[PDB]
Write a protein that binds this ligand. Structure first.
Ligand SMILES: C=CC1=C(C)c2cc3[nH]c(cc4nc(cc5[nH]c(cc1n2)c(C)c5C=C)C(C)=C4CCC(=O)O)c(CCC(=O)O)c3C
Ligand SMILES: CCCCCC/C=C/CCCCCCCCCC(=O)O[C@H](CO)COC(=O)CCCCCCCCCCCCCCC
Ligand SMILES: CCCCCCCC/C=C/CCCCCCCC(=O)OC[C@H](O)CO
Ligand SMILES: CCCCCCCC/C=C/CCCCCCCC(=O)OC[C@H](O)CO
Ligand SMILES: CCCCCCCC/C=C/CCCCCCCC(=O)OC[C@H](O)CO
Ligand SMILES: CCCCCCCC/C=C/CCCCCCCC(=O)OC[C@H](O)CO
Ligand SMILES: CCCCCCCC/C=C/CCCCCCCC(=O)OC[C@H](O)CO
Ligand SMILES: CCCCCCCC/C=C/CCCCCCCC(=O)OC[C@H](O)CO
Ligand SMILES: CCCCCCCC/C=C/CCCCCCCC(=O)OC[C@H](O)CO
Ligand SMILES: CCCCCCCC/C=C\CCCCCCCC(=O)OC[C@H](O)CO
Ligand SMILES: CCCCCCCC/C=C\CCCCCCCC(=O)OC[C@H](O)CO
Ligand SMILES: CCCCCCCC/C=C\CCCCCCCC(=O)OC[C@H](O)CO
Ligand SMILES: CCCCCCCC/C=C\CCCCCCCC(=O)OC[C@H](O)CO
Lengths: 157, 156
């Protein structure tokens, strides 16, 4: 087991894709106007939390990718990352709060699955995913309360 | 041989970019863009991407069973994420120049995945060849969309 920079940088570069979804966000009166739960973090917290999570999830995947039988785990990892990438444009760009809730719940499921499969192969890789599952849980809660606490207009059928 | 749990996991992962296409059907904005002469008709695209989701998932299923496939699957994760990113940037936000950067990075990781797949399993490499071809065409379309509509602010 090693600090493998080819692996680590590949997984980190892959995080550049969800990172870009956040980068292309702007101040948005729609978002500012939303009713929010008391425990909602300020806007500046989210890029810092996500950057930390990108590094942790990449290091976890780096460890696992060096182990025999890691195929299912990395398939879950690929799914987790793609739904993560999908969520921000659906919620912030398309303003489809209901569809975004479906997306983040699928994300949550593949984050949980990835974490479970990582623990099966390597404890530290599983542990690194725990703050990710926790943040994903909070993020789902925010999407849900956003839906519950506000006016929602119909999406396209 | 055939590992259904693996294949279905990879196929499910394709549900994410497949969803971007479902939620962002080509705009009246898109139809009014100046198109390069070789632009395919609209029905070609969901045909192409649906086929590619099945081919790339088949390829990944084969590779994920093999020893030493970690770097290959890391590339696969990378290309899928940038694939998922591209449609919302181009069709959603209509930032054509940013989208070009995204699809070029996508292209690189599709090429890297293909190469990596070939080192481990010839058939998985072959399944990625039409993907690299299509990503090349997509990159060209995105480049031409800019070049041919440079008077639009969203092209620059
Ligand atoms: C005040 C300005 C910004 C706010 C509130 C912001 C908030 C968010 N950014 C998100 C996505 C993101 N923003 C991110 C980095 C950035 N974030 C940026 C600007 C902002 N991004 C810029 C600019 C970034 C580029 C460095 C990243 C990296 C993500 C990716 C989230 C994900 O799903 O991976 C998400 C979705 C996930 C969640 O709810 O936990 C929120 C809420
Ligand atoms: C949008 C930001 C994403 C970064 C864009 C850079 C992507 C370039 C594509 C790389 C293709 C790899 C080359 C394939 C052929 C090499 C031979 C081979 O395929 O086999 C080599 C031998 O194992 C593999 O070498 C490598 O692993 C090189 C890949 C390194 C990945 C790029 C790292 C970029 C640094 C990350 C910076 C931070 C990112 C943002 C943080 C959120
Ligand atoms: C919302 C975010 C909340 C969490 C924020 C945390 C802030 C970052 C601190 C953690 C450092 C973790 C270190 C992880 C690096 C260890 C893995 C690794 O380096 O492995 C090396 C190689 O595998 C040989 O063992
Ligand atoms: C050992 C110490 C470790 C330190 C490592 C670096 C920490 C970087 C982030 C700090 C804040 C993290 C939690 C942020 C909670 C924000 C709550 C809030 O709303 O504060 C807004 C602020 O008051 C507006 O002026
Ligand atoms: C379950 C609690 C998780 C919630 C807390 C979230 C904060 C970030 C946690 C990261 C754990 C890793 C940090 C400690 C560094 C690990 C050292 C390492 O992994 O080294 C491997 C090798 O076996 C020896 O060096
Ligand atoms: C407002 C929302 C705030 C956040 C809400 C809280 C989120 C709860 C998440 C749970 C993470 C706990 C996961 C712990 C799983 C550990 C599994 C384990 O350790 O299994 C190891 C074993 O060796 C295998 O073989
Ligand atoms: C166009 C792309 C759209 C994407 C849509 C893709 C949806 C795929 C998910 C199916 C879940 C079905 C769950 C069935 C899981 C069965 C697992 C299994 O039985 O595996 C056996 C194992 O391989 C024995 O060794
Ligand atoms: C288009 C809308 C989005 C569509 C997306 C559908 C989301 C549901 C995902 C499918 C289930 C994936 C099936 C994977 C089951 C594998 C379970 C498994 O293999 O367990 C691990 C194994 O035991 C240890 O190696
Ligand atoms: C490792 C990272 C490598 C990948 C990063 C690649 C980034 C390239 C991005 C392009 C920005 C836009 C510049 C492209 C301009 C093409 C359109 C053009 O301007 O056409 C000429 C004129 O506008 C018509 O008359
Ligand atoms: C288990 C290790 C942690 C894993 C998960 C990492 C999550 C921590 C990251 C940032 C949260 C800080 C933001 C918290 C700010 C809450 C919003 C707030 O400021 O509300 C104040 C209210 O008025 C009275 O509490
Ligand atoms: C389907 C699986 C999604 C399961 C995701 C679980 C989402 C939990 C929602 C949540 O914990 O919200 C925090 C709560 O609202 C704070 O008071
Ligand atoms: C490829 C095989 C022939 C394509 C079938 C075709 O003509 O599709 C028409 C389109 O659906 C009309 O809206
Ligand atoms: C515009 C730029 C155009 C560039 C387009 C090319 C990009 C990919 C380069 C190499 C492909 C070949 C990858 C295979 C490398 C050797 C594979 C080998 O091991 O053999 C394969 C198979 O398993 C039995 O031959």
């Amino acid at each position: 087991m090693n600090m493998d920079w080819a692996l680590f940088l590949t997984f980190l570069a892959a995080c550049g894709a969800p990172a870009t979804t956040g980068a292309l966000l702007k101040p948005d009166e729609w978002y500012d106007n939303l009713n929010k739960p008391w425990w909602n973090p300020p806007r500046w917290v989210f890029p810092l939390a996500w950057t930390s999570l990108y590094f942790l999830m990449s290091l976890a995947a780096m460890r696992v990718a060096q182990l025999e039988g890691s195929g299912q785990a990395l398939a879950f990892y690929a799914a987790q990352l793609a739904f993560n990438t999908l969520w921000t444009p659906v919620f912030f760009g398309m303003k489809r709060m209901a569809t975004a809730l479906a997306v983040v719940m699928v994300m949550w499921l593949f984050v949980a699955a990835t974490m479970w499969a990582f623990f099966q192969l390597d404890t530290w890789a599983g542990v690194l995913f725990v703050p990710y599952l926790i943040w994903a849980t909070a993020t789902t809660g925010l999407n849900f309360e956003a839906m519950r606490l506000n006016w929602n207009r119909p999406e396209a059928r």
